Amino acid sequence: PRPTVIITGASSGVGLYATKALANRGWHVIMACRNLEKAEQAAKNLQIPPEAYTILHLDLSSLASVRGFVESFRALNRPLRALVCNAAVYYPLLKEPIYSVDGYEITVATNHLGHFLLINLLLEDLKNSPESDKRLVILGTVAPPDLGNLEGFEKGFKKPIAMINGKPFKSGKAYKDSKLCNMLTARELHRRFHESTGIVFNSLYPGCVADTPLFRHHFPLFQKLFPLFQKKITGGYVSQELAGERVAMVVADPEFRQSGVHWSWGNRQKEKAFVQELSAEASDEQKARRLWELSEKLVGL
């Protein structure tokens, strides 16, 4: 009997190597991906044992697809022990915003809003599971990110709104903004549900995984040289395998069962995890709650 874990965006990068590390630990991985062929080719190239994973379609940019995936997973009749919100898109140099089928700027829609709906639906499945060590793990972070007063969300977040704070569109900051929402969501998940469910709600920063397709929308020269830069200059480089293994630790290792925490190993890498409380910024306490409320409104809860 294999414990089940859902990993979004498992077809490459951190999610792919997290699938391999969890599979090697005896978990069964739900690879929730939007590109089924790309995901299947990725698992076979790594020779991940086929009995350790199953691939289901999930497009986080479509709220109907999120709801559809939840039904598809429930039809598996597999109790859920863990959910990893890993998928993301990064546009550093996108001039004009792209809007999802539901009408939302694609970076926030994919990175935050789709995950926000998935989390709220799958919370039922995590509650009902008989496992005692259940975890919800969110991939976080370490143009600075600024949500302002959530004016863009406060006003419905439809075009021409393209930023959470209502300011004009900046694709790179939109990514930073979306990962900030991931942290605040992990912070709200713990505050709202940990004492009453026993589920562990954590975020994690594995380091600079300079090799992943996250930089696919960057200049081709950037993708070629960023690993060497991160390796020989900043020292913040981490391999895809090490990042995947760190996700698996926070999901499965007993040393990481404390809830409401952000795990990291530093900006510059050595050769030991740091604990940071998610509610540390006490002045973001109300903005975190309103973000949650506005997100419930945007995804139709």
Ligand X SMILES: NC(=O)C1=CN([C@@H]2O[C@H](COP(=O)(O)OP(=O)(O)OC[C@H]3O[C@@H](n4cnc5c(N)ncnc54)[C@H](OP(=O)(O)O)[C@@H]3O)[C@@H](O)[C@H]2O)C=CC1
Minimum CB distance to ligand X, residue 195 (Å): 27
Interaction between residue 80 and ligand X (CB under 6 A): no
Specify the 3-state DSSP secondary structure of 145: coil
Residue keyed to tokens 């497009």: 59
Pairing of strands 53-57, 80-85: unpaired
295 labeled part of a ligand binding site: no
Q: Please identify, using beta-carbon distances, which residue of 58 and 164 lies nearer to ligand X.
A: 58
Please tell me the distance from the alpha carbon of residue 171 to that of residue 30, in angstroms, as a whole number.
30
Question: Which residue among 22, 56, 59, 245 contacts ligand X (CB under 6 A)?
Answer: 59
Nearest to 139, CA basis, from 169, 192, 178: 178
Phi-psi region of 85 (alpha: psi -120 to 50; beta: other; left: phi over 0): beta
**Site mask, ligand X, residues 272-301, x = CB under 6 A?**
------------------------------
Q: Please identify, using beta-carbon distances, which residue of 155 and 216 lies nearer to ligand X.
A: 216
Interaction between residue 139 and ligand X (CB under 6 A): yes
To 5 degrees, how large is the angle CA 268–CA 285–CA 127? Answer: 85
Residues 206-265 touching ligand X, rule: CB under 6 A, are: 208-209, 212-214
Residues 183-202 touching ligand X, rule: CB under 6 A, are: none
Phi-psi region of 287 (alpha: psi -120 to 50; beta: other; left: phi over 0): alpha
Question: Is there a catalytic annotation at residue 175?
Answer: yes
Catalytic-role residue among 90, 91, 104, 175? 175
Active-site residues, by number, are 175
Binding residues for NADP(+): 9, 11-12, 14-15, 34, 38, 59-61, 86, 88, 179, 208-209
